[PDB]
Amino acid sequence: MQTPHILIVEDELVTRNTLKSIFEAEGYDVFEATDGAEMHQILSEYDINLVIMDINLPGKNGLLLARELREQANVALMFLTGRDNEVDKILGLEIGADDYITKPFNPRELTIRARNLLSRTM
């Protein structure tokens, strides 16, 4: 029924372009932030159903951005990050992300996890 709105918080242009075309190929509207200030402004200004969080960002890192997000909102959240190590994965989940996916990733896996998560939260 409702058109899903996805926010990708991701500092690399090429990765954003890829994520955008993957999610548009799902019928979603894609909002883009390169950092924490752009993220907060999109979140205060537009309906957002799912946040995809990179960790290595200019300014605050994705984990802390996630922590702040979780004090305001219970919006669906998934990390998508090149931080492919057990500690960051566990922290990201502990902080309250619904999922944690490493780059490089299978795009089908990303979109099916997003879809099941959205079905559960929208």
Nearest to 6 by CA among 49, 64, 36: 49
90 forms part of the interface with ligand BF4 (CB under 6 A): no
35's tokens: 């950092």
Q: How far, in whole angstroms, is CA 108 from its chain's centroid? A: 16
Out of 11, 29, 32, 68, point to the residue binding Mg ion (CB under 5 A): 11
Would you say 50 and 26 are in contact if contact means Cβ atoms under 8 Å apart?
Answer: no
Q: Choose from Mg ion, its own copies, ligand BEF, none: what does 103 bind? Cβ within 5-8 Å by kind.
A: ligand BEF
Out of 4, 36, 62, 92, point to the residue binding ligand BF4 (CB under 6 A): 4
Q: Under DSSP, is residue 89 helix (H, G, I), strand (E, B) or coil?
A: helix
54 forms part of the interface with Mg ion (CB under 5 A): yes
99's tokens: 């999922």
Binding site for Mg ion (CB under 5 A): 11, 54, 56
Binding site for its own copies (CB under 8 A): 86, 89-90, 93-94, 96-99, 106, 108-109, 112-113, 116-117, 120-121
